[PDB]
Amino acid sequence: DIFEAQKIEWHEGAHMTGVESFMTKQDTTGKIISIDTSSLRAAGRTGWEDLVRKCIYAFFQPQGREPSYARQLFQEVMTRGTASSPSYRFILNDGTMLSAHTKCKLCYPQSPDMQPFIMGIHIID
């Protein structure tokens, strides 16, 4: 049904072959409450912890004079229920330049004991 369909896209995001990504869950104050890295750890690439840390820091870093993409997306996802960033870049510990973009959605769980939350997917370009 409608509640179940909400989970389809995020289950698919957790098993994408050929795409480097991770997912986050934020409460509605914006605080990150979980980070799912199972796709990165399965793909056996070493340096995933550094990739995730650097990607998240770039996501929350101010964009010159504008707010960070994290702020812009959080503001938009609370008002309209979905949001997306353009690409942002970061440098791994070995000097490699990478870029990423983020998409997120407000999710309304069926269980009365759970609060709404924001699911985010961060895709390496």
Binding site: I32, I35, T37, E49
Partner: peptide
């Protein structure tokens, strides 16, 4: 919102 602190991130990986 507040960005995660280094301890927030540490916890997110630890558990």
């Amino acid at each position: 919102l507040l960005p995660p602190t280094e301890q927030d991130l540490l916890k997110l990986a630890l558990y």
